[PDB]
Design a protein around this ligand. Structure first.
Ligand SMILES: *[B@@]1([O])O[C]([C]C([O])=O)[C][C][C]1[N]C(=O)[C]C1=[C][C]=[C]S1
Length: 632
């Protein structure tokens, strides 16, 4: 499978480079996710004046060494072929016409057309099974001449056939055999969008990526990582090419051979993914989509989940689906970090941390949740309390998913505490920057740092004199976020305030031998990006409100998470959106388990569900993943 790629001249002095096999990709338990697999091809090269009877002779020899698919053979192909495969039938068919041809009263053109008009009946069935074999090869030998090689067979080329033909090339003029490698995916479709692609050799480095690869010393012939993991880890996964140096003279006779580099296969790359958890998450996700649809959510068009270990940033599973109006799924795993959404009230843990650290509120502070009234009659209120007046804690605000507690926190942060009928503060630029700065510290609004390309930080619009948008930022209805940000954020809460870089790469192996990992070269770490600027009592208050959300009867997540096999904690969000002018919501869930020493965290995003008066319980997906992961 080793193509050349380079032949570098100098002092009558040639240097040739031979390609090497690409590293494998393994899950966290060593299971092979991305392998190499050999592909063989039989090719033909058509010369200046290589006759038709010669191509028929080479092809007949090939039928002894290979077996062919007899599709592709058009009826034109068979009719022509039939002419040689018995001339004195064709001659018996055109007694009269051959005499006119010789008289010069018809042309060869007219004669040919009329002959191929003259059979299809019982005497085209004269083609024996081996005839169709020779013709299946003949038809590919004529495809468009000049020394451009046409392929005779690509799929299903066996090793018996490759060998029999390779050792016969001196008797098979124009014929050739090639050995090439392609990526093999033992687990099928799972995670193919995250793995990415390598260029198809006929491609070489794609134009979009050219120059960037040439600036590293590669060639336009080289096969390279095109996207996502293959691209991200391209230079650990690529081998070191075998490089020979030759010194010739006069006419070219080599007098000294040099082995600059023997060559080595690429390093194996081990991921944080647990492929069995990944398959289980994917299966629960499809069951949850289908269950949500049968409950009315037939416009829901995305469903995404990230699963991490919050202590080290490891991405244990990452899955997404796009859903059409009939509930057919398309794989959309990369949407967890390339797509951004309005996530709603699940951000409110971050809002409180931002309030504490600017001393806008104190841990444990109570405020009255009630409809707020502003100048001119504009109102704002909490969903759970549209008409009443309730005194609540910061952690009860999280349990209930209070809007008004966060509005009041935002107004205190803007140096303008709520009073009934007030006009909203005119300039909130400095408050907005402080609120975004607080949210940024848990992962809401910056790139999380995932070791994959094309991560977005979400949509971040100006905060100057739009106090309405500013209050909306405090409840999750302004800036947009990715599911991976939600997961980084809940992980920060779960691990006592350390914001960690998510990573799907876990380690790199110094791989030398075929199908053997080798010794460990390098660990891929989730670096601590920052600790939140908050005291331990502030972090624990948010933890406690998250636990009450999942475990108290009034918590928005009680119905889904109160009976998880280990105690779980988290936060829900429901945000109003619109599709073709119809009211919808996004539903979002973050959480972690066990409460006491969390080893699992997740986020879930569904888009364009119906607006609840009927509350769907899409968090059951998180319940189910928790119950599976802590089964034993
Ligand atoms: B918030 O995003 O989410 C809360 C409910 C939850 O945690 O799932 C309610 C208040 C906030 N959402 C809204 O104010 C807008 C709503 C859309 C559908 C019901 S409320």
């Amino acid at each position: 499978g080793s193509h050349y790629k380079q032949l570098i001249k100098n002092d009558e002095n040639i240097t040739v480079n031979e390609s090497v096999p690409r590293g494998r990709i393994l899950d966290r338990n060593g299971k092979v996710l991305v392998d190499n697999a050999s592909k063989m091809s039989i090719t033909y090269t058509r010369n200046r004046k290589t006759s038709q009877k010669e191509m028929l002779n080479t092809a007949k020899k090939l039928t002894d060494l290979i077996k062919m698919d007899t599709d592709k053979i058009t009826e034109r192909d068979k009719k022509d072929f039939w002419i040689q495969m018995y001339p004195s039938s064709a001659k018996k068919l055109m007694r009269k016409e051959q005499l006119m041809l010789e008289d010069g009263s018809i042309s060869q053109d007219q004669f040919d057309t009329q002959l191929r008009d003259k059979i299809g009946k019982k005497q085209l069935k004269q083609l024996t099974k081996k005839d169709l074999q020779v013709l299946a090869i003949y038809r590919e030998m004529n495809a468009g001449s000049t020394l451009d090689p046409q392929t005779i067979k690509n799929e299903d080329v066996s090793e018996k056939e490759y060998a029999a033909v390779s050792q016969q090339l001196s008797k098979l003029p124009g014929v050739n055999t090639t050995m090439d490698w392609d990526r093999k995916y033992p687990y099928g479709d799972t995670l193919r969008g995250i793995f990415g692609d390598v260029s198809t050799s006929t491609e070489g480095i794609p134009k979009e990526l050219t120059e960037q690869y040439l600036s590293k010393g590669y060639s336009r012939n080289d096969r390279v990582g095109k996207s996502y993991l293959e691209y991200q880890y391209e230079d650990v996964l690529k081998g070191t090419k075998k490089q020979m140096k030759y010194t010739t003279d006069k006419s070219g006779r080599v007098i000294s051979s040099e082995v600059l580099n023997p060559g080595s296969r690429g390093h194996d790359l081990q991921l944080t993914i647990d492929i069995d958890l990944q398959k289980k998450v994917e299966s629960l996700l499809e069951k949850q989509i289908s269950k949500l649809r049968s409950q009315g959510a037939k416009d829901m068009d995305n469903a995404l989940m990230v699963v991490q270990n919050p202590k080290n940033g490891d991405i244990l599973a990452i899955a997404g689906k796009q859903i059409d109006k009939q509930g057919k799924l398309k794989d959309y795993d990369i949407g967890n970090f390339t797509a951004q959404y309005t996530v709603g009230s699940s951000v409110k843990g971050g809002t409180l941390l931002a309030g504490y650290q600017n001393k806008a509120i104190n841990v444990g502070e109570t405020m009255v949740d009630e409809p707020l009234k502003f100048q001119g009659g504009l109102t704002k209120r909490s969903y759970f309390n549209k008409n009443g007046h309730v005194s609540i804690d910061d952690k009860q605000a999280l349990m209930h998913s209070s809007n008004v507690y966060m509005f009041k926190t935002a107004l205190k942060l803007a140096g303008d505490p709520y009073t009934s009928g007030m006009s909203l503060p005119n300039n909130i630029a400095d408050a907005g920057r402080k609120l975004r700065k607080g949210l940024n510290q848990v992962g809401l609004g910056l790139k999380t740092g995932i070791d994959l390309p094309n991560e977005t930080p979400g949509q971040i619009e100006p905060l100057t004199n739009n106090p309405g948008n500013y209050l909306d930022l405090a409840i999750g209805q302004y800036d947009t976020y990715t599911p991976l940000q939600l997961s980084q954020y809940v992980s920060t809460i779960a691990n006592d305030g350390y914001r960690i870089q998510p990573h799907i790469g876990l380690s790199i192996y110094e791989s030398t031998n075929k199908d053997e990992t080798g010794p460990l070269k390098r660990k891929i770490k989730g670096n601590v990006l920052n600790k939140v600027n908050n005291s331990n009592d502030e972090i624990k208050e948010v933890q406690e409100g998250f636990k009450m959300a999942f475990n108290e009867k009034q918590g928005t997540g009680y119905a889904s998470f109160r009976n998880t096999v280990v105690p779980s904690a988290g936060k829900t969000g429901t945000a109003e959106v619109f599709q073709d002018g119809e009211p919808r919501v996004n539903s979002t869930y973050i959480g972690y388990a066990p409460v006491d020493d969390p080893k699992l965290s997740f986020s879930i995003v569904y888009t364009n569900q119906p607006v609840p008066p009927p509350w769907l319980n899409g968090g059951d997906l998180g319940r189910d993943v928790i119950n599976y992961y802590f089964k034993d």
